[PDB]
Design a protein around this ligand. Structure first.
Ligand code: CYC
Ligand code: CYC
Ligand code: CYC
Lengths: 162, 172
């Protein structure tokens, strides 16, 4: 989709010209930061379930009715259960992409796009997620600059959820 | 469009799964060879003018019928449009290179060009030769040992050649 690179190659093209020096410096910086972001990405990848199933309860616990209040949009069924589970993972699997990609581009085109109508139409409370997000936001046990990066895309998501 | 990083993700997403250590590595390693890739794009971008001028000089000395009255490249008018063409193609390779993915190239350049020259009655095989010539020029320069920190680029250099070839097929 859209990354610091595609960004630059885009500008040069829409101006019908070869790449600028700046744009080049840009990719460089992109690469220079990549390191931490990547390593970060892996760490999250290696802690999928521990986080998914983690934030899982976090939402089931804070908002209990979603365990009994009968309704398609509720986890009061091995179905909604599985689904609210399917969903949670999706988000995680999306923040990593962003790290590996060096930008938000992947979330924008796969999840962020049309997020409203979707939550709307299927009746899905945005807070439902911003809660689970919070969970991971502080249980990914990251430090240094890797934590910087993750809690960056994390907020971005929260942002788009409000 | 897609860059080498996005590509890997797109695929991972299709199967809706996270990246396998394999994938992470592949990518991290690319970042490693980063610098090389940039001297690459830079060096080529910096000589676009020369690269062209020469591949063309060649091309026309090789196939001299295009400059004979009637030759598809006859008349300043067409000569210009020809060069413009080349430069255009090169310009897209550079993008592909920087991206480390032919995505862009194909989409915004290669796609249906084969047909284009045909409709125009432009020898699609003679356009392939002009490209080939640019690859050689382009590579010699990108991979030149002078003025740069000695190290290995054959791989990147092969990768580049691919994009060039990829395009030269699309028309021929
Ligand atoms: C294969 C192309 C040839 C080759 C390349 C080679 N280059 C480097 C290292 C560097 N390249 C740059 C260039 C840039 N960095 C940027 O941010 C930008 C954008 C403005 C550019 C153009 C830099 C700064 C370096 C490192 C410093 C240096 O010059 O030593 C290497 C070393 C790579 C590395 O350590 O990762 C190599 C091997 N070497 C060859 O022998 C081929 C002819
Ligand atoms: C979990 C935090 C809360 C919750 C979730 C819940 N979600 C659904 C259904 C859907 N979720 C999505 C979301 C996406 N689809 C996508 O393609 C993407 C991008 C990668 C996203 C983010 C969609 C489209 C649906 C509907 C279709 C489907 O089944 O996938 C349900 C089922 C709702 C229903 O009406 O059947 C549930 C229960 N529920 C909770 O109780 C939590 C608080
Ligand atoms: C030079 C290698 C050979 C050659 C070329 C030649 N090409 C044209 C005209 C066109 N070339 C293109 C190609 C592109 N236009 C674009 O915008 C892009 C980027 C996406 C590409 C790749 C097109 C569309 C044309 C037609 C319209 C135009 O001029 O832009 C000509 C002009 C022919 C004429 O009859 O006017 C020529 C001569 N000719 C040769 O002999 C070489 C083998």
């Amino acid at each position: 989709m859209k990354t610091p690179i595609t960004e630059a190659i885009a500008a040069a093209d829409t101006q019908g010209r070869f790449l600028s020096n700046t744009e080049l410096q840009a990719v460089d910086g992109r690469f220079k930061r990549a390191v931490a972001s990547m390593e970060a990405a892996r760490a999250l990848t290696n802690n999928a379930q521990s986080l998914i199933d983690g934030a899982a309860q976090a939402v089931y616990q804070k908002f209990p009715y979603t365990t009994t209040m009968q309704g398609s949009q509720y986890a009061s069924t091995p179905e909604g259960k599985a689904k609210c589970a399917r969903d949670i993972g999706y988000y995680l699997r999306m923040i990593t992409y962003c790290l590996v990609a060096g930008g938000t581009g992947p979330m924008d085109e796969y999840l962020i796009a049309g997020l409203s109508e979707i939550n709307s139409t299927f009746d899905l409370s945005p807070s439902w997620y911003i809660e689970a997000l919070k969970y991971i936001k502080a249980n990914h046990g990251l430090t240094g600059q890797a934590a910087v990066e993750a809690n960056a895309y994390i907020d971005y998501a929260i942002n788009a959820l409000s | 469009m897609l860059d080498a990083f996005a590509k890997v993700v797109a695929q991972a997403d299709a199967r809706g799964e996270f990246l396998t250590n394999a994938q992470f590595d592949a990518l991290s390693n690319l970042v490693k060879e980063g610098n090389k890739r940039l001297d690459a794009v830079n060096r080529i971008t910096s000589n676009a003018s020369t690269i062209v001028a020469n591949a063309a000089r060649a091309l026309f000395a090789e196939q001299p019928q295009l400059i004979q009255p009637g030759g598809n490249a006859y008349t300043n008018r067409r000569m210009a449009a020809c060069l413009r063409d080349m430069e255009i193609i090169l310009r897209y390779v550079t993008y592909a290179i920087l991206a480390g993915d032919s995505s862009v190239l194909d989409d915004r350049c290669l796609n249906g060009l084969r047909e284009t020259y045909q409709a125009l009655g432009t020898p699609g095989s003679s356009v392939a030769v002009a490209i080939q010539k640019m690859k050689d020029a382009a590579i010699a320069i990108a991979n030149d040992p002078n003025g740069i920190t000695p190290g290995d680029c054959s791989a990147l250099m092969s990768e580049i050649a691919g994009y060039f070839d990829r395009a030269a097929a699309a028309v021929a």
